Amino acid sequence: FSWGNYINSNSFIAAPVTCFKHAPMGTCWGDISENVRVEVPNTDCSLPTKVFWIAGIVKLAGYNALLRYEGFENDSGLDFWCNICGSDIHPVGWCAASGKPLVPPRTIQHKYTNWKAFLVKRLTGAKTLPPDFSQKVSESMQYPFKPCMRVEVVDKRHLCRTRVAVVESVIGGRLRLVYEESEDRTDDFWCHMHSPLIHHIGWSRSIGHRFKRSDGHFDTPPHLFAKVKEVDQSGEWFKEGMKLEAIDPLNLSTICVATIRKVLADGFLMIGIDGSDGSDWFCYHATSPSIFPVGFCEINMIELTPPRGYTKLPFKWFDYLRETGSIAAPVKLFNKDVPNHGFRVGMKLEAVDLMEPRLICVATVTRIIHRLLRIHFDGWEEEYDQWVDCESPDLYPVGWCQLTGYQLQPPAKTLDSASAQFAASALVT
Ligand code: NA
């Protein structure tokens, strides 16, 4: 499987890197656009040694760039895909700086006679990578989470409690965790290091969350954990028994009828899916975009999943509130920003399968409802589509798996004339 070929064959569009709050280089992507010029190996050569040429970005698909050698003009016949963050991608001037040769592609070697004048007139006023781009890329893939670090995380077999887990490995900022005293040896849980699921040692005791009573393993420094958003300070709050709609943490395809079962400290809530010990309950922060007011699904034309075993169907909230003698959580408690992240229906990305989070897959955004993206797994049925927040750390740009070395599941300031002249000095015909 090749993202470039899939995108070129189908005329697909990819979500830009800047759409992704948590993506490597998200906040250094201003320099990257169509017509940026780079120095890259010239594969259109039969020379003993590796040589380079200039190429321009024809198309960007996340981290992946479709490049055209300079001097091909409109001739797309040798257009090639690369990861723009790859180590063979250099700013213009890198050859002259490094004593490497710029050699015309063989295909166009007689198309121009004065190669130095050609390069000067093409490179003068061009956009290239910043000189530290390479270093920003290397820094974007140093993660402060390390093997042997301990965290608190939900027990996937008993959502109502946490237990301690250890980092086994870190790939692209994703943690492979094993539970301490696990039922098996290894590989129990995958999440992003900025997942809201993981907490400092002491978190559960501190907020009132149930926990399983408890090499070289050490407590993750508390400062490494994602900040929790502050709640509305008015003095009106969630109460036990209030009704709402929530994403089922065991079925990310469904939004369900739900109940506030316990108010914890620091804005955390134990929530139950109605009709399904207290063993079932799962913790959402009050600022979670995975919870919604009564009537959210109906107003936004989303299927609501009714309580397991409830027989007055199709489900009507007015009747269920009266039958159960309960009230809706006030709509004001769920007000939040909808960032302008620039996702559009049809855009391609790499998505975590949240029902099997080890898998990162070829995926499409197929619906947008404020913050909420409907994520489709290309080649699978729509029934397996998942509800995912637009700022989720489980969504990646096209090319993220290639950048970080994670396995991808396939579908089922311009240069001045002195800079141009400097760059062109590396020319060997
Ligand atoms: Na395992």
Curated annotation (Swiss-Prot):
GO MF annotations, alphabetized: chromatin binding; histone H4K20me1 reader activity; histone H4K20me2 reader activity; methylated histone binding; NuA4 histone acetyltransferase complex binding; zinc ion binding
MBT repeats: 1-105, 113-210, 211-307, 315-411
Any GO CC annotation of this UniProt entry: site of double-strand break
Main location group: nucleus
Lineage top rank: taxon: Eukaryota
GO terms (BP aspect): double-strand break repair via homologous recombination; embryonic skeletal system development; negative regulation of DNA-templated transcription; positive regulation of DNA-templated transcription; positive regulation of double-strand break repair via homologous recombination; regulation of apoptotic process; regulation of cell cycle; regulation of double-strand break repair
Clinical note on disease: A chromosomal aberration involving MBTD1 is a cause of acute poorly differentiated myeloid leukemia. Translocation (10;17)(p15;q21) with ZMYND11.
Entry function: Chromatin reader component of the NuA4 histone acetyltransferase complex, a multiprotein complex involved in transcriptional activation of select genes principally by acetylation of nucleosomal histones H4 and H2A. The NuA4 complex plays a direct role in repair of DNA double-strand breaks (DSBs) by promoting homologous recombination (HR). MBTD1 specifically recognizes and binds monomethylated and dimethylated 'Lys-20' on histone H4 (H4K20me1 and H4K20me2, respectively).
Protein name from the UniProt record: MBT domain-containing protein 1
Annotated organism of origin: Homo sapiens
